[PDB]
Amino acid sequence: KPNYALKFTLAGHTKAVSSVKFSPNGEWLASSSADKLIKIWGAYDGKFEKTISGHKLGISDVAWSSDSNLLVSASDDKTLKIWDVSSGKCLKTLKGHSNYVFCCNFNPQSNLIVSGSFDESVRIWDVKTGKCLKTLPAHSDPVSAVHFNRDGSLIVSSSYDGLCRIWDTASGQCLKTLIDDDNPPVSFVKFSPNGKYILAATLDNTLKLWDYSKGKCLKTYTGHKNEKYCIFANFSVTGGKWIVSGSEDNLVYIWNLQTKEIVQKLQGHTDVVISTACHPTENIIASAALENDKTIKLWKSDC
Amino acid sequence: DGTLDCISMALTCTFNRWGTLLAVGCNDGRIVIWDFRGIAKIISAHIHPVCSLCWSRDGHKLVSASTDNIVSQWDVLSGDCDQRFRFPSPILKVQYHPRDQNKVLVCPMKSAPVMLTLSDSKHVVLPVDDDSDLNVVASFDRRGEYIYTGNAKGKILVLKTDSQDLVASFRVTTGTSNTTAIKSIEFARKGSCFLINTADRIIRVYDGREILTCGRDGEPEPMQKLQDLVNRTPWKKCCFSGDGEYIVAGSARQHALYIWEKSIGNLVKILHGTRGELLLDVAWHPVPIIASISSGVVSIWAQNQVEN
Amino acid sequence: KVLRDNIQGITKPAIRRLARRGGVKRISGLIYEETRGVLKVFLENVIRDAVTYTEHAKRKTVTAMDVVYALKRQGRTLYGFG
Amino acid sequence: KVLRDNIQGITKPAIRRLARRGGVKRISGLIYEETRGVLKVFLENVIRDAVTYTEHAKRKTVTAMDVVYALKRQGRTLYGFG
Amino acid sequence: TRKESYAIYVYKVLKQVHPDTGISSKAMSIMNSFVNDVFERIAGEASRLAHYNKRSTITSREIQTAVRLLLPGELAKHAVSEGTKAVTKYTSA
Amino acid sequence: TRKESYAIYVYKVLKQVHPDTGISSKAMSIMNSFVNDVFERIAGEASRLAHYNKRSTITSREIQTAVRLLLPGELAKHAVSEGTKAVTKYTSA
Amino acid sequence: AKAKTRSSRAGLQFPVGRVHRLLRKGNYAERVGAGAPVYLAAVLEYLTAEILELAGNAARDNKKTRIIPRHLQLAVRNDEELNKLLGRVTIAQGGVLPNIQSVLLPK
Amino acid sequence: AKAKTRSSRAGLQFPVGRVHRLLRKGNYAERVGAGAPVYLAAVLEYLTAEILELAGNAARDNKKTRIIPRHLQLAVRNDEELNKLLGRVTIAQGGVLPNIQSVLLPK
Amino acid sequence: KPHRYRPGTVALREIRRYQKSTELLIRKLPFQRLVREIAQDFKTDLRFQSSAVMALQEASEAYLVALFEDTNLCAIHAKRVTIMPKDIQLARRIRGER
Amino acid sequence: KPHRYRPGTVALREIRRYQKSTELLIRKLPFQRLVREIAQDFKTDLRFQSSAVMALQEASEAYLVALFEDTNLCAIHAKRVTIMPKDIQLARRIRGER
Amino acid sequence: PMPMRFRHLKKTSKEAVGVYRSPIHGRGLFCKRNIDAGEMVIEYAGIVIRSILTDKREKYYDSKGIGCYMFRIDDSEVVDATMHGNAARFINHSCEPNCYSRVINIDGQKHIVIFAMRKIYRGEELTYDYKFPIEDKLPCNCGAKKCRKFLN
Amino acid sequence: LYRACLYERVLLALHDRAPQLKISDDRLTVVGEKGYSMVRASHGVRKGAWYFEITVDEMPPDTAARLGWSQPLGNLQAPLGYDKFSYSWRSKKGTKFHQSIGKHYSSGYGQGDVLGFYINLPEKQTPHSEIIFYKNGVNQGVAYKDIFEGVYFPAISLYKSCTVSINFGPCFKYPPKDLTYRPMSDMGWGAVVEHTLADVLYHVETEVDGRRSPPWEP
DNA sequence: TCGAGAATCCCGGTGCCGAGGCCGCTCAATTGGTCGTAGACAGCTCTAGCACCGCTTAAACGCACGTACGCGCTGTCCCCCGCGTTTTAACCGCCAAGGGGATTACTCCCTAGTCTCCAGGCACGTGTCAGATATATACATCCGAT
DNA sequence: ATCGGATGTATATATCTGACACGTGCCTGGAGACTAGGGAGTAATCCCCTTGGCGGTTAAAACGCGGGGGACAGCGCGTACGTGCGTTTAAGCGGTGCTAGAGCTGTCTACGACCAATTGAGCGGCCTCGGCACCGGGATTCTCGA
């Protein structure tokens, strides 16, 4: 079981933080918020690297490039924006989403972008020209989370209408639709590291790991509190296999991956722990809370 | 099952390595690179229509053949003519080498296929068995390790791509004792099964390992024999599925599409196009979408699951 | 030994010969293949029915009396074959 | 009681009624009597053949089953009369 | 295989009508097929009418009636008279 | 005088297909006449065939063959199936 | 001495015994196949089913419970196979199916 | 007891024995009348006489001793009642009797 | 002002209602008298079933509307809407009735 | 100067000699191959009598010249000397072949 | 053949019909390709159970607050689609149905197939007669002029 | 003629089983394969009080037998209580089933229950008729007091692969010591002798003129 | 329109095999009893047909009249006839293998034929609603002015 | 191309009913059981027709090639035909009444059925030879430009 202890507390976003992500090299931590600002920080010392502005409205998601060189920022201004992380330059501004863009993710080869917006349509974007290559009426409700598989052949999409839909990338083909006998608003979704499973959070204090080849939920995770906000979930792999997530009770929940049992509860945040990020290499977890906290906390364990 | 109005004079198309883009030639001699749902690029390739188009493995290069016997390599990002060559006996086909984009084989009309390189403007003339075929189609295998050449007289030579040495040989039969014009040789992007379209309107599916172990001048039987036993229809163009377990044939006689399997070989299905359209070109999405070019118009044929 | 396309083995000169026998002066092209089709369709029945007889006859060769009884059943009876 | 000329008892309105039933718009006069003739000729057979049955039936009245077997033998069989 | 026909009686009645005439064996076979046709015709019609009469006995009255049903006008009349004369001759002894 | 028919049977199968739908006596006798005609069709055809086979016995194979001769394509196919069913159901007696 | 008719033994309606007696009195063959009446009557059952079914289709298409011979004519004229079966056959109170030729319509 | 053919007592040419044989073997009735084969064979002989006579007429008109099927077809299409009897019949090596239409003629 | 429908129109509706109707279109008694007149030609003083003569008239009228039908068709091939006797004659000719 | 008979005239004489001749006008082997091709559709590898196939071809050609004949007649009623496919179709229609 | 027809139906069902927002109520089955009369529209596929086990399941769902999706095959069997089913669980009812339910026997097992009462065209919402017995009341909004105002 | 029964003792009559109902005379157990079915004994009660048992030899979770009584008109394919002429118990929890209605006016059932069945019909409920259920002789209680007219017989319904068997009195395990109730075998030979006399009287009627029976009461 | 030329008719002569005649070699035709029975026939009903006659009326015949398709004529296009040439494969003759077709001889499973008994079918009554019919009504569609 | 008016047609309604679904008692065909023969089925044998191929020929098919001939389109007119309205007329209801003739039963008898004994009319098979088919050549007659 992990023993994550607070090592660095990070803050500075004037408004509610919406996403924090570790750089794939583990060198930086990108924090987006509704303040139209992004903040790069040092991933090991909590050293504030810089602030990147340019978005016109609140930012609902930000995602790193695989080479740790680019960052896509999906903002409430209906725009994406691709930035060079080293220069902070707005290399591209992606226009075409008809409403608030909530999520964004790069392809495993970092040359393509998937984007979900309030328009309830998922847009598929070029990187080097920033051109929208596809647009899909994916869901009947604003999209919450979109993500690539291990290779970029499949795109998983979640939305408030409770649907988790796997789509073909080359054709936009709606491959699969996962249903759990009800309509639980799915606020987050992502593939497994092996691309074999899918972790999806529903707004009923429940996380669900599904098999893709089976199309059925394999494991369930409860004990946390998440019913309104887009609370992120990550796979803790650098140490033991765990499932880390935020919760509306100001806690940072860590379940065992296999046994689904809570293996740690990181407390110290005063607001809802809105965003989570797991270090790609180290046993480091960045937990960012909402506006009543406005703080990001680094946690380091020994296993 | 879905067409595109934004392109005209569709003559030949080719999927990229991942089935994300489609470079189609037009009668004006232009390349229209269309994305799977708008055009991504327009290249002024030739004044002459383009009849042969192939993507590079990295996808950054496309080899194009005009009807002016003008072959040219183009960068997909820029659209520049990287290299340009011309020959006698107008080119029937070009084909990048799948594991070396510097190399490209070319099947001309009356002359033997020749393998050139882009780094050095050299060329290696591949041998011809009967010395009088004047019409030999040729193709790399899935890995570009061997070259399969089929003549108008049913003779089939398997050479090694580096030495052009005869590593296998056999003549296909019309059943009784006669030869048939080898219309085309296709391979599977996965595995080792390949197909031959012949003048007998009968597609013959083999496994290249069996030809290699059959040796020179042997009697290798096909993995499968495929035809329209009902209409006895020729096949203008055929292709495998992306996986290699489904095979499609284009009946330009009645502008239809036949779909068989590989192992069993039973006909999966049939797709009917506009009875007034003349079927020209056929391709399959490499990773269940099928592009068709008929009367200058492209149509798309997808296949969805039980959901949506 | 799989057969095919003997329908076009019917020569247009043969067709026009039959037409002249029928007392026809001017003919169009569109007829012949059409004609052929009909021909096929026509025989399409009898042989089958004929071999149907041969079906019940439990034999491998097909005989005239087969088509005799067919044309009879087809109301187009013929003489001179038993 | 010797009968005659009931053929013209067929009214031209009746003929044109039958024609309209057959889906005919414009008709000439020359048809009707011609029509009538055919009619006669047509029935010319059946009744005789019918009474031929009645001939072998050794009876004075003529029955439906007579014309039934006639139309049968005339290849124009009818239903609804036993 | 003993096969039965009528071409001998064809030649007979030919000489009875035309003594100085030959025939193509083809034509003989055609005529014999015609004989068979008319025979099956008359037989089927007779059986059918007897069925209508519920009769299990096909007699000369049936014969004449069925011929009249089949042959037209003077053909039928002459045929009826001929069959009548012949059955009269046979019944005379 | 007892006059047999199949109105009972046609009404039975009517109900078996349409318990709701009624029937007219005119169309009833039409059905009866029709089935009589087609039964005579098949009877004559099978007898003709067996005579060609010169087989004095008439069996089910003859019936299948001759109905195949009679019916336009798929009907026969469908037909023969149930027929087979029947005899199977009867051979399994 | 338990009784069971061959129709019940075939679970069908048409009288196997009656039709057997009929074909016997029909003078077609000396001996008979005992299952031939069963088979033929089954065929009759089938074809009758189809034709009456189409008849009832037209009938309730016309809100008609009791089927009229016009329904019969329409049914036998609509189906290709049955029409081919009964092409040269006529039907009492049949009439003609709706049919107007192209040029008949004024322009 | 010398055996003479029944056709002799009938004074005819076609073998009435073979006739009655085909009759009994034809499955038409349970027992054939005595003079019925006689009558029908007489009819057959008469009609054969008619057709052969017409054929000889045609052949001698064509200055021909051996009578080819063409003569017979011509006579067939020359006798109206016989034609009516045989219009539904097809004729091998028959061809078509010369029939010329009016508007077909030149001017 | 008096109204008169254009030609055929009324006859067109007549066609429509006749394909709609199914009953006979011939008066019974005239047909019966004709039948008996024909009968006395072959033999005089012969009786009939009303069912029999109803069958006669129905079957006749059926043959007659069939003849009218295919003669209409032929006249279509004759490119006319008016009928010509030759159409009927040649129809019988194709019907083997000559 | 070269001579050419007026149109039809040669074909007219052809008609005359064909009504004069009686033999077949179809090459044997092509017809036979067609028959066997049709046969394999219903069942493959079936043998035939030369007499049988001769009967097939004769009876066919008879039906065919009859069709040509009455279609000629119809075209007369069509007032044309050229034949039209619709003539054949409607002829079959009257021939109950539709 | 009912087996061949059933194979064809199970092959074409996924692309013949769809489910969309319905003016009748919520979401319902709409026609995506013109369906002829009497042809197989859709199987109400699900869990084939005996009748005696219905109540134990029903009360079970009654304990779970999950609606019962059960159709009586006959007096002995029922297709329960509550937990496991197909799109046929979204066929609304109309007093004027263009469809009708019938039980077929394929290889010994019974299948409840909704066939088309008439020629159904593309876009039409699919509805049949549930034939629900008269209770003491579910208002109907099928829109038919003959509507009983109540399924029961 | 005679109604001779192919049975050494009063057992489950093979004449009144469904074609989907299997028996094993090693224990005369009854089993099925698909759904429910019903079998009945050889005898049938018309009056008096009597008693039998059912021994259960196999009850998996997907295996639920039902045990009780049923009058004629009882469709032997139905699960013994689907109609108003049958009254049984469901062998999952002791639940009285009649008119397909389940009632929990009952005790609990066990997988290895040797269940005793007592039932009293008199010589519009039949007056003073009742049914009592016992678990190994221990009173499980009254099942049905309202009992319709008409003869009844003990019956067993099978679900998928249920193994149960009926059993008479002389080999009992927990029998009631009543002097009036009768085992299965006793009423069995009573009805057998009664039907023997029925054959006697019918052959008398048709064969010899006259009939005559004693002072009616018995 | 009187010749040139061309397709044809006819004549004599050649050679052939089918038409025919005759020959062994039966089985199927005849003959003669013998028997159960199909129907021939007589002799009854009764009913359906046949005719009578009256009453109502929808129907039929004829008129007038617009009008519009049938028909007749012209000019065009194209296209199919006729002839020339080139290619081919039908034919024809011969050979050869076998695989099926036909045959015969056993063998016996199935059906015809018989007799018994009764139960489904059939004639026959019997209420009773599907639909026929009539009426007022609301909707569709043509025809002519605009 | 539209609107207005005329008219014709689909609808709801009410009731009448007579076909029609339904139930009976009584009959006999169907089922059930038993016996025989022998049609059918199987198998080994023979034959022998067919299916296959091979080579040479050319008449025949493919193809091309004008080009006059007619398919066809259009265009004038006119006569014949729909139509709506007159008129008069037999058609139909219906109900009456007689019986001629179907339609039924009961004989009794001639009449094939059938079998057995007998065989010669007829049929497969074998010469044979002469109209007939083919050919070549001469004379005749249609036809297309004067």
Residue numbers in the entry:
A (entry chain B): 32 to 334
B (entry chain A): 18 to 53, 56 to 306, 308 to 328
C (entry chain H), D (entry chain L): 20 to 101
E (entry chain N), F (entry chain J): 29 to 121
G (entry chain I), H (entry chain M): 12 to 118
I (entry chain K), J (entry chain G): 37 to 134
K (entry chain C): 3815 to 3950, 3954 to 3969
L (entry chain D): 278 to 400, 440 to 534
Paper text:
Compared to the well-studied WDR5, RbBP5, and ASH2LSPRY proteins, the function of DPY30 and the extended intrinsically disordered regions (IDRs) of ASH2L in the MLL1 complex remains a mystery. By combined NMR, SAXS, cryo-EM and biochemical approaches, we find that DPY30 functions through the extended IDRs of ASH2L to restrict the rotational dynamics of the MLL1 complex on the NCP, thereby promoting H3K4 methylation at higher methylation states.
After several rounds of heterogeneous refinement using cryoSPARC57, we isolated four different subclasses of 4-MLL1-NCP (Class01, 02, 03, and 05). In the end, we obtained three different subclasses of 4-MLL1-NCP structures (Class 01, 02, and 05). In comparison to the MLL1RWSAD-NCP complex (or 5-MLL1-NCP), the 4-MLL1-NCP complexes displayed much higher dynamics at the ASH2L-NCP interface. While the majority of the 5-MLL1-NCP complexes anchored on the NCP with RbBP5 and ASH2L at DNA SHL 1.5 and 7, respectively, the 4-MLL1-NCP complex adopted multiple modes of interaction. With RbBP5 anchoring near SHL 1.5, ASH2L binding sites varied from SHL 7 to SHL 4.5 among different subclasses. We envision that increased rotational dynamics of the 4-MLL1 complex or local ASH2L dynamics reduces the probability of the MLL1 SET domain positioning near nucleosome dyad. In this scenario, the MLL1SET domain has to go through multiple spatial arrangements to optimally engage both H3 substrates in the NCP, which negatively affect MLL1 processivity.
